[PDB]
A paper describes a structure:
The S protein is a single-span transmembrane protein that protrudes from the surface of SARS-CoV-2 virions to engage the host receptor, human angiotensin-converting enzyme 2 (ACE2). The ectodomain of the S protein consists of a receptor-binding subunit termed S1 and a membrane-fusion subunit termed S2.
Thus, the RBD-1 of S-S3H3-F3 appears in a transition state between “open” and “closed”. Our structural analysis showed that S3H3 binding tightens the B.1.351 S trimer with its RBD-1 in a transition state between “open” and “closed” configuration, inferring that S3H3 may inhibit viral entry by locking the fusion machinery in the prefusion state and/or by affecting RBM exposure to cellular ACE2 receptor. S3H3 does not block ACE2 binding to S trimer. Thus, these mutations will not affect S3H3 binding, explaining the observed broad-spectrum SARS-CoV-2 neutralization potency of S3H3 Mab.
Numbering used by the authors:
A (entry chain E): 1 to 217
B (entry chain F): 1 to 215
């Protein structure tokens, strides 16, 4: 199974540099060309640069010229892209894809993606809190619960209910940036007969800080 | 180079109907009767996925309802019949010249009947109050269309400050919308008031939907 793996996210300060890795498996590494794409939320897709892994021949965009440096490691079957001096505009998700050439060149596979946040702030792990109704009139046969995730930088953060045991009635709301820290909430709706017997837990995981938080409602 | 202009920027089509999205190129991508175009589908939090290549050719594994047509500087993406799972952001790509670029994007939405929101309000947690802060959250789920407004009323008086609202995207299977409203206050601000009310203004209810609790 052809796959392109990438890190979850990367935090960088203004004026510094980053090195991103794209790992290919299940297929010959040098037999294809590695390409990079930039996606900033709301902006859409933007093309970065392509490279020939065998000879390390590069073609870069006039926009990204001198901003990015492409290199490959043929021993590890991994491709690298170095970005110098990221700015507030350079914050975005980066993808690496294998472009398949038959006549026209499309992308048959895409990487996992890496979120690059340019900021001077330091990683803050999230603080999870349970949300319980504590009251009701017995007007509903379903029980709604919620979980608050606040005070964490940078994005993203994983939120599941009972380690993903409940895939239904779950809603994960996008995060809102307040006071340099992101805050989101999530809700789950379980039958009124399930809640008394079964316990509902909020499973939160922060990849950057490598912390896992479990709070029972 | 070759620039792509997609119109419209957002489209809404009812289930069972046909969805047309145009991708116009500044210069001709046609080469030897074979035009360079690619239609990609990207759902939130995922990389794009190929649907039609060479503008005439459906990729193996993609449903037959996806198709494309056109030549030269004019191309279209036709989805008939549209399904609830088809809501996503579509892109068009051109390999003809260098550097390659992608279109502006078109967000497809499904048209259905209206739905009223389910309002649920959770008072601040005992753990958060121990730290000195207080956060009251109000969840609104399964309401269509997305146009809605929430108002916080403490002891019968409205407070517009300290509110954080977040709207979700269209649910693939449900095709509904959900939002949450967070009103942050300190421990003293929370203990000096009793009634906390969350209300919702939606086109399906002449009067706001009242949900509240007493400290």
């Amino acid at each position: 199974q052809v796959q392109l793996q990438q890190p979850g996210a990367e935090l960088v300060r203004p004026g510094a540099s980053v090195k991103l890795s794209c790992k290919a498996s299940g297929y010959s590494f040098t037999r294809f060309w590695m390409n990079w794409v930039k996606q900033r939320p709301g902006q859409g897709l933007e093309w970065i640069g392509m490279i020939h892994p065998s000879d390390s021949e590069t073609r870069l965009n006039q926009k990204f010229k001198d901003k990015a440096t492409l290199t490959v490691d043929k021993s590890s079957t991994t491709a690298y892209m170095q970005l110098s001096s990221p700015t507030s505009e350079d914050s975005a998700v980066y993808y690496c894809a294998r472009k398949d050439y038959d006549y026209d060149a499309w992308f048959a596979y895409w990487g996992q993606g890496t979120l690059v946040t340019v900021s001077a702030a330091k990683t803050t792990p999230p603080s999870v809190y349970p949300l319980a109704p504590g009251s009701a009139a017995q007007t509903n046969s379903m029980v709604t619960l919620g979980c608050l995730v606040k005070g964490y930088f940078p994005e993203p953060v994983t939120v599941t209910w009972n380690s993903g045991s409940l895939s239904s009635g779950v809603h994960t709301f996008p995060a809102v940036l307040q006071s340099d820290l992101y805050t989101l909430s999530s809700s789950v709706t379980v039958p009124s007969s399930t809640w008394p017997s079964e316990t509902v837990t909020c499973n939160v995981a922060h990849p950057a800080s490598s912390t896992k938080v479990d709070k029972k409602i | 180079d070759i620039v792509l202009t997609q119109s419209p920027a957002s489209l809404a089509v009812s289930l069972g109907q046909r969805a047309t999205i145009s991708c116009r190129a500044s210069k001709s991508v046609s080469a030897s009767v074979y035009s360079y175009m690619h239609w990609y589908q990207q759902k939130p939090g995922q990389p794009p996925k190929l649907l039609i290549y060479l503008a005439s050719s459906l990729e193996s594994g993609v449903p037959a309802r996806f198709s494309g047509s056109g030549s030269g500087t004019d191309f279209t993406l036709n989805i008939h019949p549209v399904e609830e799972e088809d809501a996503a952001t579509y892109y068009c790509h051109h390999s003809r010249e260098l550097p390659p670029a992608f279109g502006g994007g078109t967000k497809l939405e499904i048209k259905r009947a209206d739905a009223a929101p389910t309002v649920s309000i959770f008072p601040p947690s005992s753990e958060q109050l121990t730290s000195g802060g207080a956060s009251v959250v109000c969840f609104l789920n399964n309401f269509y269309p997305k146009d809605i407004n929430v108002k916080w009323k403490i002891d019968g008086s409205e407070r517009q400050n300290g509110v954080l609202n977040s709207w979700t995207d269209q649910d693939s299977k449900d095709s509904t919308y959900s939002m949450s409203s967070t009103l942050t206050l300190t421990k003293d601000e929370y203990e000096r008031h009793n009634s906390y009310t969350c209300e919702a203004t939606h086109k399906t209810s002449t009067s706001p939907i009242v949900k509240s609790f007493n400290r």
